[PDB]
Swiss-Prot record, chains A, B, C:
Site (Not glycated): K8, K14, K18, K28, K37, K40, K67, K72
Tau/MAP repeat ranges, renumbered to this chain: 3-33, 34-65
UniProt superkingdom: Eukaryota
Residues with the N6,N6-dimethyllysine modification: K8
Cell location: Cytoplasm, Cytosol; Cell membrane; Cytoplasm, Cytoskeleton; Cell projection, Axon
Covalent crosslink: Glycyl lysine isopeptide (Lys-Gly) (interchain with G-Cter in ubiquitin): K8, K14, K18, K28, K40, K44, K50, K66, K72
Tissue: Expressed in neurons. Isoform PNS-tau is expressed in the peripheral nervous system while the others are expressed in the central nervous system.
Modified residues (Omega-N-methylarginine): R46
Protein name: Microtubule-associated protein tau
Span covered, complete protein: 621 to 696 of 758
Record's comment describing the protein's domains: The tau/MAP repeat binds to tubulin. Type I isoforms contain 3 repeats while type II isoforms contain 4 repeats.
Length: 76, 76, 76, 73, 73, 73
C-alpha cells in the first residue's frame, strides 16, 4: 500500500466595504481628581500600578476589512 | 510502498475598501489632578508604575485592509 | 519506496484602498497637574516608572494595505 | 498654627448653540417642477423653487465665569 | 491648630439649544409640481415651491458661574 | 506659623456656536425644472432656483473669565 494526499483549497472570496464618508469623530476623556496617601507603596513582583493615568486609542480605518486564513497539513 | 503529497492552495480573493472621505478626527484627552503621598515608594521586580501619565495612539489609515495567510506542511 | 512533496501555493489576491480627500486630524493630550511626595523613591529590578509623562504616537497611513504570509515546510 | 489653602477646579462651562452635531442624508432627491407661460415678480417678492437652506443665527451662547479666593490671617 | 481648605469642583454647566443631534434621512424624495399659464406676485409675497429649510435662531443659551472661597483666620 | 496657598485651575470655559459637527451627506439630487416662456423680476425680488445655502451668523458666542487671589497676613 501507498499513501497519497491532494490538498487543493480554492478561494474566490471578497471582503469589502463602500463607506460614503466617516464624519467628525471625537475622543476627549477627562481624568478627574485622584489622590493616594500612605506610609509605603511597596511592590515586589510583576505589579502593574496605574494611578490616575489615561491610556487612549483612536483607530479610524477607511475600511477595517480583515481576512485571516491558516492552513496546516501534517504527516507522521 | 511510497508517499505522495500535492499542495496547491489557491487564493484569488479581494480585500478592499472604497471610502469617500475620512473627516475631522479629534483626540484630546485631559489629565485631571493626580497626587501621591508616602514615606517610601519601593519597587523590587518587573514593576510598572504609571502615575498621572497619558499614553495616546491615533491611527487613521485610508484603509486598514489586512490579509494574513499562513501555510504549514510537516512530514516525519 | 519513495517520498515526494509538491508544494506550490498560488496567491492571485489583491488588497486595495481607493479613497477620498482625507484627514483633518487633531491630536493634543494633557494639561493636568501630577504630584508625588515621598522621603524615598527606590526602584531596583526591571522597573518602569512614568510620572506625568505623555506618549503621542500618531499614524495617518492611507492609500494603505497590510499583507502577511508564512510558508514553513519541514521534512524529517 | 498652619493653614493649607488648596482649592481644585476641574469644572467645564459650555455653550452648544445653533445647528450642531446633525446628520442630513440625501436631502432633495425628488423632482420639483414649475411650468408656466410667465413668472412675473414686481415688488419685494421672495421666491424659492427646489432650493435647500440651512440659515442659522446665534446672538446667544455666551459664558461668564467669576471666582475669588481671598485668604486673610 | 490646623486649617485644611480643599474644595474640589467637578461640575459641568452646559447649555444645549437650537437644532442639536438630529437625523434627517432622504428629506424631499417625492414629486412636487406646479402648473399654470402665469405666476404673478405683486407685493411682499413669500413663495416656497418644493424647497427644504432648516432655519434656526438662538438668542439665548448663555451660562453664568460665580464662586467665592473666602477664608478668614 | 506657616501658610500654604496653591489653588489648582484645570477648568475649561467654552463656546460652540453657529454650525458645527454636521454631516450633510449628498444634498441636492433628482431634478429642478422651471419651464416658462418668460421670466420677469423688477423690484427687490429675491429668486432662488435649485440652489444650496449654508449662511450662518454668530454675533454671540463670547467668553469672560475673572479670578482674584488676595492673600493678606
Amino acid at each position: 500500500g501507498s499513501v497519497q494526499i491532494v490538498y487543493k483549497p480554492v478561494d474566490l472570496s471578497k471582503v469589502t466595504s463602500k463607506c460614503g464618508s466617516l464624519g467628525n469623530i471625537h475622543h476627549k476623556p477627562g481624568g478627574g481628581q485622584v489622590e493616594v496617601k500612605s506610609e509605603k507603596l511597596d511592590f515586589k513582583d510583576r505589579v502593574q500600578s496605574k494611578i490616575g493615568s489615561l491610556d487612549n486609542i483612536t483607530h479610524v480605518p477607511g475600511g477595517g476589512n480583515k481576512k485571516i486564513e491558516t492552513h496546516k497539513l501534517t504527516f507522521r
